[PDB]
Design a binder for this molecule. Structure first.
Ligand code: IOE
Ligand code: HG
Ligand code: ZN
Length: 258
């Protein structure tokens, strides 16, 4: 009745309702480090999350989203392969039921334990709704999570999950600083792609960071305790909410580093 990640309505079935699933610029993709083109004309990333204002957190089935106030240029992304100012609207993760799987993008076929998506939209379009009808409407900052040491900045997110356990639940979530989720370096790979969940619109410039951030087993264990189902429905654990890699077709992955 509605897409999911299970046997009967998983990624393999999405093309039936969303023909674009078999498009030419789909995501995620595998990043073959040896074929990425070092492009020295790529500018450095400019992350400006100092005036960032988180509002809430919700479980929408599929995953959990932390939402931000995007009525003003408070938190922005610019530079890199981007032209123009992009506003932060929300961030979420994709993870697996085991540590050796969970990320959407892979590196030389290697899958990480999870992947953080920081979703931005092109301000020249006025609102997110218009941005999705354009080839350069969205920009998603992708960050890989590896299991190791605890990540301080992630803990406030972890302590609130118990209140949004099932589909539809939301909790007030103010004063969260996203800068606590960034690795030391901002070296990246970039390529034109799409949303990794229906509608799968091909309106995204992907910026995947090279350096992953570390998170502890307990931190990740808590993501795994969330629920796909709403309250009162039978219980299905929210794990493995990732789409497998898609064909690169006629695309080239550039690297901002040598
Ligand atoms: N895993 S991922 O980073 O690729 C991803 C990021 C954002 C969204 C999303 O905002 N919902 C769809 C959506 C849309 F398709 C059009 C619109 F105007 C608003 C939306 F919210 C979906 C997937
Ligand atoms: Hg578009
Ligand atoms: Zn996403």
């Amino acid at each position: 009745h509605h897409w999911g990640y299970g046997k009967h309505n998983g990624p393999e079935h999405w093309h039936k309702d969303f023909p674009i699933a078999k498009g030419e610029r789909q995501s995620p993709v595998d990043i073959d480090t040896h074929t990425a083109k070092y492009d020295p004309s790529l500018k450095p990333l400019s992350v400006s999350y100092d005036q960032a204002t988180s509002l809430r957190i919700l479980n929408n089935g599929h995953a959990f989203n932390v939402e931000f106030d995007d009525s003003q240029d408070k938190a922005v992304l610019k530079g890199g392969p981007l032209d123009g100012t992009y506003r932060l609207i929300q961030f979420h993760f994709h993870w697996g039921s085991l540590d050796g799987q969970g990320s959407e993008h892979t590196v030389d076929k290697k899958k990480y334990a999870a992947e953080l998506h920081l979703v931005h939209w092109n301000t020249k379009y006025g609102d997110v709704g218009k941005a999705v009808q354009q080839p350069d409407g969205l920009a998603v900052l992708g960050i890989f999570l590896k299991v190791g040491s605890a990540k301080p900045g992630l803990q406030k997110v972890v302590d609130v999950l118990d209140s949004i356990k099932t589909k539809g639940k939301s909790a007030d979530f103010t004063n969260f600083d996203p800068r606590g989720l960034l690795p030391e370096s901002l070296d990246y790979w970039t390529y034109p792609g799409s949303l990794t969940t229906p509608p799968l619109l091909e309106c995204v410039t992907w910026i995947v960071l090279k350096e992953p951030i570390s998170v502890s087993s307990e931190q990740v264990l808590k993501f795994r305790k969330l629920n796909f189902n709403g309250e009162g429905e039978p219980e299905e654990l929210m794990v493995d909410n990732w789409r497998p890699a898609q064909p690169l077709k006629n695309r080239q992955i550039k690297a901002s580093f040598k």
